[PDB]
Write a protein that binds this ligand. Structure first.
Ligand SMILES: COC(=O)/C(O)=C/C(=O)C1(Cc2ccc(Cl)cc2)CCN(Cc2cccc(Br)c2)CC1
Ligand SMILES: [Cl-]
Ligand SMILES: [Cl-]
Ligand SMILES: [Mn+2]
Ligand SMILES: [Mn+2]
Length: 181
């Protein structure tokens, strides 16, 4: 697993809180992308990770004149264009709901208004994995309808192992315990 080994090498060598903070953030981003790949694989949908909203619009509505609209340049993780409906997808890996709420608010208020002007029926979907319990929580009524079961096989233990080693290595470093938390 060259992903695990790459983090381990960085954790072995890191000496400063700033480089350590970046490793921690990279591990959190990596387990996020791991969940997205596994989810898209299980649902046999196309795997994407951050698509510019303008690019989504051009895929679903090639004839659009971009310059006719105020398109926020957000990059949701992924999308599903059924031909009648656009599900905007964002992955989350978290034990809590705050990150979901924050992103739900953002994409609801920024994406829906312009998609209604353009005329594309859209739903904001956030799929969260709890990295401790592996349970999946979905917001998006149309998504649940399309995918009533999510047969993922998730294992977040290696991400926990790596990040724990990093936190252990900097447990007596005041600068670090500030930056991560
Ligand atoms: C899970 O939901 C998200 O948090 C998410 O997918 C965030 C992202 O994709 C960014 C990379 C990332 C960081 C931490 C984790 Cl754990 C997972 C992914 C990349 C995009 N930025 C938002 C942004 C930044 C600059 C310009 C624009 Br426009 C938009 C946030 C982090
Ligand atoms: Cl360093
Ligand atoms: Cl964004
Ligand atoms: Mn993203
Ligand atoms: Mn995401």
């Amino acid at each position: 697993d060259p992903m695990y080994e790459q983090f381990l090498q960085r954790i072995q060598a890191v000496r400063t809180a700033t480089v350590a903070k970046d490793i921690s953030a990279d591990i959190l981003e990596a387990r996020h992308d791991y969940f997205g790949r596994e989810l898209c694989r299980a649902l046999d949908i196309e795997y994407r990770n951050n698509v510019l909203l303008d690019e989504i619009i051009l895929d679903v509505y090639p004839g659009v004149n971009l310059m006719e609209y105020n398109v926020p340049h957000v990059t949701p993780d992924n999308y599903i264009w059924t031909g009648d409906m656009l599900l905007i997808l964002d992955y989350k890996v978290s034990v809590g709901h705050d990150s979901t709420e924050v992103t739900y608010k953002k994409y609801t208020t920024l994406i829906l208004p312009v998609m209604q002007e353009i005329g594309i029926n859209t739903e904001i979907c956030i799929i969260r994995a709890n990295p401790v319990t592996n349970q999946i929580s979905i917001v998006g009524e149309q998504f649940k309808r399309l995918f009533p079961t999510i047969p993922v096989e998730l294992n977040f233990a290696r991400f926990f192992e790596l990040r724990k080693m990093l936190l252990d290595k900097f447990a007596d470093d005041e600068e670090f315990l500030m930056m991560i938390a």
